[PDB]
Write a protein that binds this DNA or RNA. Structure first.
Ligand SMILES: Cc1cn([C@H]2C[C@H](O)[C@@H](COP(=O)(O)OP(=O)(O)[C@@H](Cl)P(=O)(O)O)O2)c(=O)[nH]c1=O
Ligand SMILES: [Cl-]
Ligand SMILES: [Mg+2]
Ligand code: NA
Ligand code: NA
Ligand code: NA
Length: 326
DNA sequence: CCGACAGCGCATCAGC
DNA sequence: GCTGATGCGC
DNA sequence: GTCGG
């Protein structure tokens, strides 16, 4: 990437804010500014040039000059010398270990990947799976593998019922050439706004995908969200594909477009879009867009026949998925 | 010179 | 066991 | 940490 030095610096600072400081707004400030710089098709030569882009303010501007002049930030190399913070930063890379579990492990002298393996009985189920697949979960999914995973998933849900609708969202739907995980929006013509005839629909889909040994592990399970692990089959004598993370969301169809807007992202896009909706008197979640009252109460769901309908309520021009990569 | 910063699903734990 | 918070994740 | 009021 063209400005990868700057975007790497900003990402590291962002990871520090989230993993150690727990300064979630600082986290989001660095990652927003990293996002715009990464999408900027021009080689940033100074913090002043950077300060013209949205998200880049005084302090990021200053840090870009320091990095462009020295190749590093003082703040970053003091963090890399802090052994508690660096241990914490590493442990939060394991799926299921956050700042709270990380600093509890550090205080027990659990500090390295091998330490975790030696004390696996101290991990909850999620953390075990993150540890088991730690290397795999550091690997990106080439788009060609996403296509083969989409192939299995979409056919399998048709097998459990031919009217099922499955849409692979996330970065894949935005056109990314590789993705971190797989995000599947699932909906069924029989399933409208939580009208209770018979739930259990997600379990049936999960069951079938376990049956064919595509889904290999379970991180979470409820009526609307399944999170877990999956794997492409190999031909005889190829290396196994890495295990991959998978999130499947079951949503009523009348909420399908709010659902696919949410699951397509990006997370920063959703934050920006939902904030702007607040600025126009609405609130957006993965299910509905509602009007906000003068006092904060939310209204009844508004009708939606397309993603574009939601952009229209808040007076945005429609952005195609490939330009939502904020 | 300040306060806002999206909104949710699920698993686990602390205290009862 | 339940509530309610905290934790981690999307 | 940024931005908007
Ligand atoms: C983390 C996050 C995700 N989402 C929505 C929006 C988001 O697009 C969707 C999937 O979450 P994802 O973590 O899989 O993000 P992704 O775009 O797929 C890429 Cl980062 P990759 O996974 O390909 O590496 O969930 C949010 O709305 N808020 C969030 O805080
Ligand atoms: Cl913050
Ligand atoms: Mg994803
Ligand atoms: Na600016
Ligand atoms: Na993690
Ligand atoms: Na995900």
């Amino acid at each position: 990437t063209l400005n990868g030095g700057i975007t790497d610096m900003l990402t590291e600072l962002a990871n520090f804010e989230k993993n150690v400081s727990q300064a979630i707004h600082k986290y989001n400030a660095y990652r927003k500014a990293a996002s715009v710089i990464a999408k900027y098709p021009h080689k940033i030569k100074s913090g002043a040039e950077a300060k013209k882009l949205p998200g880049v303010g005084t302090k990021i501007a200053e840090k870009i000059d320091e990095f462009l002049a020295t190749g590093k930030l003082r703040k970053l190399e003091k963090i890399r010398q802090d052994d508690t913070s660096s241990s914490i930063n590493f442990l939060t890379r394991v799926s299921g270990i956050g700042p709270s579990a990380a600093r509890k492990f550090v205080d027990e002298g659990i500090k390295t990947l091998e330490d975790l393996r030696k004390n696996e009985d101290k991990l909850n189920h999620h953390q075990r799976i993150g540890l088991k697949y730690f290397g795999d979960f550091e690997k990106r999914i080439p788009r060609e593998e996403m296509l083969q995973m989409q192939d299995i998933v979409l056919n399998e849900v048709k097998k459990v019922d031919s009217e099922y609708i499955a849409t692979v969202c996330g970065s894949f739907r935005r056109g990314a050439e590789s993705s971190g995980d797989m995000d599947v929006l699932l909906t069924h013509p029989s399933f409208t706004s939580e009208s209770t005839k018979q739930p259990k629909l997600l379990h049936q889909v999960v069951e079938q995908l376990q049956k064919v040994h595509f889904i290999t592990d379970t991180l979470s399970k409820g009526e609307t969200k399944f999170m877990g692990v999956c794997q492409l089959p190999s031909k005889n004598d190829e290396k196994e594909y890495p295990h991959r993370r998978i999130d499947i969301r079951l949503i009523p169809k009348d909420q399908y477009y709010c659902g696919v807007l949410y699951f397509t992202g990006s997370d920063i896009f959703n934050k920006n879009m939902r904030a702007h909706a607040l600025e126009k008197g609405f609130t957006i979640n993965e299910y509905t867009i509602r009007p906000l009252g003068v006092t904060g109460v939310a209204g009844e769901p508004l009708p939606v026949d397309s993603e574009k309908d939601i952009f229209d309520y808040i007076q945005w021009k429609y952005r195609e998925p490939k330009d939502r990569s904020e």
